[PDB]
Amino acid sequence: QSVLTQPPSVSGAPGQRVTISCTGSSSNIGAGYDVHWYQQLPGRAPKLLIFDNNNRPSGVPDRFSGSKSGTSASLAITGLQTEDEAYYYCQSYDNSLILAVFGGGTKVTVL
Amino acid sequence: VADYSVLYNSASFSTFKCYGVSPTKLNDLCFTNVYADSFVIRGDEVRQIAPGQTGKIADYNYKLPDDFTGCVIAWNSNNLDSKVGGNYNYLYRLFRKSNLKPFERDISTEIYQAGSTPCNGVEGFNCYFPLQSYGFQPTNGVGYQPYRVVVLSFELLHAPATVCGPKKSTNLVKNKCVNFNFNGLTGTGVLTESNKKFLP
Amino acid sequence: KPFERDISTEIYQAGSTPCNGVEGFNCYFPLQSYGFQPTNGVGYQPYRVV
Amino acid sequence: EVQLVESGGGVVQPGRSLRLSCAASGFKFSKFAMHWVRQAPGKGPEWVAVISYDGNQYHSADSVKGRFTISRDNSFNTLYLQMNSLGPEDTAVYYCARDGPDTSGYYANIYFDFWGQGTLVTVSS
Incomplete structure (x- = not known):
């Protein structure tokens, strides 16, 4: 089960911006722990996309950005194209249940 | 200008021991310079941070003089310094040939010379790496979870005072x-x- | 004050939070206890004063 | 390049035990602790267990405790995961992941930077 609550699907069209809002409880994100995002293209294993708050790793276009505030986090896709149709998951850590927790995932759809 | 009343009333620290001064009367006296130093140790070695104590920590890492004045503050920090799979980024000295003088440090990692046969640049037999590594896990016992320690020292002698109570x-x-x-x-x-006009 | 005595052993109050009949935090028993042993140093052996 | 290949999946009847492993290459295997992560078909990923960089310390998820055991061979660059008495809800795709090198603030934050490919494991009759 997904501890972190995430919207089921976000639509869009090429050119504009879309945002994914991953929200957490007091123990997971409200305790000060960071937030991580991966990308799972269809038929492939998930790949790291945004590690730590923003701070993108090597080999990724700068179109992807994200931030965290309060008890929730948000990822933003700038200048969306048609090749971004995949799944995106938000990940963090929990200090009460004592295990890494994942989000429900979002299927970004480009019209 | 310091304010120790907020720290003393935080009600979150599990150890607040002051030697030679009471915490309540800490807001009504002035000092010259205040020294603050901090580190992280195990939950069972916390009793070694005191004047006139023996043990590995007090013998090889941190030593307090017998005429010490100041306060010792510590609080459990299991949520911030321990991770699943073990945390091995905290070290402590374990082999040495003499005890530290009060308020002294050493960060040399020369190979220890145990036994009689000498050695150099190798850790094969009877030659041990001095620094060990604390193994911190969130499921450890109460006596093994890491603790955060902060020690303050005062002098109350000579010089014009510069830090005062509020x-x-x-x-x-x-x-x-x-x-x-x-x-x-x-x-x-x-x-x-009055209608007098002082100079600025 | 000079030539005065006190024998009440009510619990001591330290810090800001009050307490009563408990010794948990910042509330300590006032009276201590001397520890006298025949092998102690000269600075710790008991003395009789009149 | 950091690449991971895993194998040991198959179709099994309930109650039997399996054993799968992944072999790493391209990096010093001894340094990094490693995680096991499974993902049910069509759902979000879930965490399974973790083993330290020398095998002395380990940790497992509460759900799979008492049934899943992980071992490590530092010489042969392989790590092992043992499952006993498979249940009907153990069908998923299992990845073996690598711990994150640098996590910046705090010491409790963990993340996975390199993933394998997965082996399909299903239980039926």
């Missing part, structure tokens, strides 16, 4: 014989409005 004030009155204490100036009198 001396406060009150409201003003007029046309009444009162006991004014404007800064260091004192005395009794009847304060009233």
